[PDB]
Amino acid sequence: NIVTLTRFVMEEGRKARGTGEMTQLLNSLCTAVKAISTAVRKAGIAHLWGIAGSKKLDVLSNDLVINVLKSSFATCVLVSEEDKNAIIVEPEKRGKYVVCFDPLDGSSNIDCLVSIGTIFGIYRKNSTDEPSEKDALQPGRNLVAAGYALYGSATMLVLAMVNGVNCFMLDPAIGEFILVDRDVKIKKKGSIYSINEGYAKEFDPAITEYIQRKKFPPDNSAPYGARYVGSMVADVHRTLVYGGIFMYPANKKSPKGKLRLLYECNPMAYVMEKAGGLATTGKEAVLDIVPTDIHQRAPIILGSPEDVTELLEIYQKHA
Amino acid sequence: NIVTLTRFVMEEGRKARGTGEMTQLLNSLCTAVKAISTAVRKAGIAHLWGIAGSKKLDVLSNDLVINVLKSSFATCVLVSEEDKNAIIVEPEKRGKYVVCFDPLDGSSNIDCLVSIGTIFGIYRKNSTDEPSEKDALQPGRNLVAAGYALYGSATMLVLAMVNGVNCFMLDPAIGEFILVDRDVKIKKKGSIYSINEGYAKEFDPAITEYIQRKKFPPDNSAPYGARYVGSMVADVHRTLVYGGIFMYPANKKSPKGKLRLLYECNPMAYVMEKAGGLATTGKEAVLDIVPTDIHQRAPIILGSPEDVTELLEIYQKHA
Amino acid sequence: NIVTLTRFVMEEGRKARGTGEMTQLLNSLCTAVKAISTAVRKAGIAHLWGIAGSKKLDVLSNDLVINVLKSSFATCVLVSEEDKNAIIVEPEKRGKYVVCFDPLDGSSNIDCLVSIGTIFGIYRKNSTDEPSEKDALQPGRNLVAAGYALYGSATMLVLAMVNGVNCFMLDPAIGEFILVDRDVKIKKKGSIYSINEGYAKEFDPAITEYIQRKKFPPDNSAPYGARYVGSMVADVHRTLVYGGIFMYPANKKSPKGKLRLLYECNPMAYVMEKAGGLATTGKEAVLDIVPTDIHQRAPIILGSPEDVTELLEIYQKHA
Amino acid sequence: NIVTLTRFVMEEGRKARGTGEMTQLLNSLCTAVKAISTAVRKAGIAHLWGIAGSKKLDVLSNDLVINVLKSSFATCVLVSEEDKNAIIVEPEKRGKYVVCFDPLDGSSNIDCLVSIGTIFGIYRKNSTDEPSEKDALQPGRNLVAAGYALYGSATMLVLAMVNGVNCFMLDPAIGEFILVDRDVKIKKKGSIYSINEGYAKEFDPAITEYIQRKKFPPDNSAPYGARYVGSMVADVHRTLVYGGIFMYPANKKSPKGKLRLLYECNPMAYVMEKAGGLATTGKEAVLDIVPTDIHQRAPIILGSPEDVTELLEIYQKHA
Ligand SMILES: Nc1ncnc2c1ncn2[C@@H]1O[C@H](COP(=O)(O)O)[C@@H](O)[C@H]1O
Ligand SMILES: Nc1ncnc2c1ncn2[C@@H]1O[C@H](COP(=O)(O)O)[C@@H](O)[C@H]1O
Ligand SMILES: Nc1ncnc2c1ncn2[C@@H]1O[C@H](COP(=O)(O)O)[C@@H](O)[C@H]1O
Ligand SMILES: Nc1ncnc2c1ncn2[C@@H]1O[C@H](COP(=O)(O)O)[C@@H](O)[C@H]1O
Ligand SMILES: O=P(O)(O)OC[C@H]1O[C@](O)(CO)[C@@H](O)[C@@H]1O
Ligand SMILES: O=P(O)(O)OC[C@H]1O[C@](O)(CO)[C@@H](O)[C@@H]1O
Ligand SMILES: O=P(O)(O)OC[C@H]1O[C@](O)(CO)[C@@H](O)[C@@H]1O
Ligand SMILES: O=P(O)(O)OC[C@H]1O[C@](O)(CO)[C@@H](O)[C@@H]1O
Ligand SMILES: [Zn+2]
Ligand SMILES: [Zn+2]
Ligand SMILES: [Zn+2]
Ligand SMILES: [Zn+2]
Ligand SMILES: [Zn+2]
């Protein structure tokens, strides 16, 4: 009994007696992701190089996501990392949902062919007045659904909702996402730390001490392994499946961290918590932060509960 | 003028006036690569979860290459990371070439969907004696062709020969590798350092010093960025295209480093040198090491010349 | 504003306030069709011929259709051309729907690579007693939905329901059926007659006279063109889109015609009528015949209303 | 032993000791074919209906072949059914071969999704004079290679040369044509007749008599089955693999038949003869007709020897 994402979404829709609007939203998202996936794998690239004689992924992915979501008649406010201001869906195509997304995460890894993906956060419009940019300023805790598509060796879509986290593998032969890991839970403690040690000179005392323990454990256990793909979707997904910890904290030349709150942090923090993990800035929990700006940045620490807890305790140490 | 990998090798073969054996071998290598990519991308995976009522990638990739290479009738001896002993092709199928290959590099990244690939080195038989492992124990400097296939966001095959390095992007729609980067040359100096710092406790003084210098630059320049995918093929490719340095030096468990010389170090060292870069163990040149064990290991530091020489100088400073 | 079949099905489902059971049924059908389509195009055939060293489409298609439909939890009785008796779905997976289908039409065209397809008829269980083979013995007039997938130069899925007929093209790059012809209507009169003139010696007086008119028009107009692919799905689809007439009447050595009533005739008769066409046996209308046997055969004449009417009048001529 | 079309032509080239020019030409033909197939199958069609916010197959197929053949550097003159005049390749790209091709055969079947294909004939230049149309006006008997690509339920490329006929099935997953039928030989006698009977009023006495004999067999055998896809490539392929006869004789509009000699009749006549079959105008052998017009038409009857000779005898009986 094989489960396609389409069938899974539909069943979650009926079990919740939804009017069918969100179900359509998720089906469109899934369709947009397959269209980005094919573009990422370079299908039809030969024609680009004039195979029959006589654009950028970031822009194409964004266009695909915008149009597909508008055509779902399920959204009223869209927030993209590629648009300075929130997109207000045309009245005739409005739904009750607000979507925040990262059309193509890992830009610096684009040209070297390293893994990249798509991240999204789905919110229910919490008011009655006209759709505006503020409708997307809800804290992650309010998320109805969040997830991501990872374009690695294989394309995978991870979806998280109140019920839990599920991983679906894309079978490109039939354009179908197959459920291959149901109700996933991150392990209590991992053995991998992921962070750009390049900004070592700018790390606060906590991170600096935490890193040190990983390489030189006081209790003399085995040192953690290091892994940094350079793309949030990839590092995070490896975290969810192998366990461990992922980090992108602030630093002298980037006080509020680099990663954006609405379409990168919240989405991943939500997937992590629903998988039995933690996601913190170092002091407060990502999902509880009250967004003040659509493109606001936020420090983020996530992964296995024990590894994250160990770090939270070091922060208190330097409280 | 669109140029496919097929046309490219066929043309080189003619310029060189080869009898066609090496050309058929590179063509077979090309076919094997497309077959692995399709598998890695999970095509047909739906039949796995019985979409119609009802073999790991490592063994499959290995079996594909073996079968495809034997069937080329251009090889006599084969060395695989998956076989304890060298493989001697049956007489009826013997050619003059010796191939050393890493069917699926990046085993630890297989399940988390991170980039993986295939590495290969080709040598001509150097004796009239009956084929045996000896024929595979030549120094990298004798390679006639080397390269790899990266199965990342998209699939790319990098090929190097006496003339230079060329990158071919795979257009999966038509099953052709399109030439997208001619006679590639690495930047003299990069700004990215790649290594697993989890072995900090086991690094020697030079490596330690180099890494610190990358984080706290003496001339107070901006520190280098850190990147470590975990798959040699992925980190090495980013090094070739973006510039910088890649390192896997000796440690406790691996006093002579981890990576294998015949099918990992040499192929990447040949590619790196043909692109104007360097590849060293820290003491000598990778391509000049005469192996004595087909599964011999060797330390390796490679990438932009200026970055490598700087580390090389650290080594001789301590000596 | 592009419409995928998935979105179309969902919207037709909400507009009709359906519980969502039929919607799932149609999504599964659509998924099964893409899985048959990939198998028909021979994807992965290289592995069959041992590409990595060391079944029939009719059977595979049937398995795919059976399993996918059972997993929809939307059917109670299935009727396949490949099974002597109706399939009674397991109690735990029962839905209210009855499906009759031709998993792979055009068997004789299979080995010569000519177009083949899948035909289906969806019925609502019209009683209360236990699901039995009789639940599938309803006359086509009772059809809730009917259509077919044509695996020609390109794969297309034609779907007909009370509302009308729509054609969706399959974009294999993203495994998505795209609406390309909405509310299709066959033209009043065509200029192509399709029939196997091989059984000329066995045709009744009506057909014999009708054929003659096509070649030698009494009014001296231009003779009709002849076309006979040899596969019902192909000939019929060309009929729906180009107009004209398709015929498979009885004959001395096949008194009740060849084509089967439940999964070939009814489905196509329904698609035709909803497209403004006609489908007759020569006397009565296909959709009104009361099925007596699950694999009962029936003569069929279909296509443009004028061309079919012309033939019905010749029958009355020899009444 | 899996054999791809690439390996096959490369091997033949070696056995023949060619300089590699014809091999690169057949390799280019192979690439062009895969590019057309992908297009015919409608891959990427979603971008047409603006799935991301926003050229007929005949012109595209034509442009692909032209560009791909010119870029092979193996041709000097090209004849296409889509160009009024022969094409003379620029000096810098000139080879010794002359190619006559039918980029997309079966134009009337394009929109109804029925099987279509590409037909090609290859000749070596027969003079030292400057390239011109003359070089393309040689009798079929001079072909060095001919064949076609059928885009039916699956894509297949049939290739014929002095040695014989071989069929290669395209595995779209890896973009390779796999040898699935070696040294093909047509049945001495078939049981299928293919022709458009709509021109009955215009057929000559022999054709008329033959067709009647096929329906009412004198020896009272079972009548032949009728089949006419409407695309020469499709009907001819079924004739080669199942046996039987294919016909397109003269009529009012086309007194010298319809099908073109250079890129339709000859290629199929060469293939049919190399497979032990016959191809005649009814009076002489197709391959021996010396053309005088690149777009010259010719009557053609081809298929199983016994079936063709029987019709040939009808012709001489009347004469
Ligand atoms: N496909 C679905 N999967 C999960 N929850 C759903 C689904 N459809 C509806 N829901 C739940 O029902 C609420 C209302 O759905 P809707 O009427 O479609 O906007 C959503 O906010 C979800 O909490
Ligand atoms: N396709 C090719 N590309 C580059 N060099 C080639 C090629 N084919 C042959 N050669 C060179 O010619 C030598 C002999 O080729 P072969 O006669 O095919 O064994 C090889 O060892 C290479 O040095
Ligand atoms: N997706 C749909 N498209 C068209 N009609 C539908 C759809 N879903 C439901 N219906 C109609 O509603 C009836 C009951 O639907 P259901 O409750 O899903 O079995 C069906 O028999 C159809 O007449
Ligand atoms: N791949 C091949 N398959 C069959 N015959 C070939 C092949 N390559 C060359 N030949 C034969 O050798 C002749 C000269 O080839 P070339 O030197 O490549 O122009 C051709 O005209 C054919 O007769
Ligand atoms: O080079 P840096 O600063 O480590 O950037 C890495 C981060 O940047 C991003 O590309 C920005 O979204 C993330 O995907 C990734 O985690
Ligand atoms: O986990 P570690 O010790 O960093 O080793 C990773 C290395 O091992 C390999 O997977 C091969 O063993 C390489 O691809 C990669 O560079
Ligand atoms: O060879 P015949 O008798 O014309 O059979 C043709 C018919 O047979 C079938 O293959 C049987 O389903 C139909 O698809 C097609 O219309
Ligand atoms: O419609 P008609 O007159 O039977 O012609 C069909 C023939 O024409 C072609 O389409 C080429 O003109 C052939 O492929 C086919 O055999
Ligand atoms: Zn991002
Ligand atoms: Zn982004
Ligand atoms: Zn390796
Ligand atoms: Zn390996
Ligand atoms: Zn059938």
Ligand SMILES: [Zn+2]
């Ligand atoms: Zn059937």
Ligand SMILES: [Zn+2]
């Ligand atoms: Zn044609």
Ligand SMILES: [Zn+2]
């Ligand atoms: Zn044509």
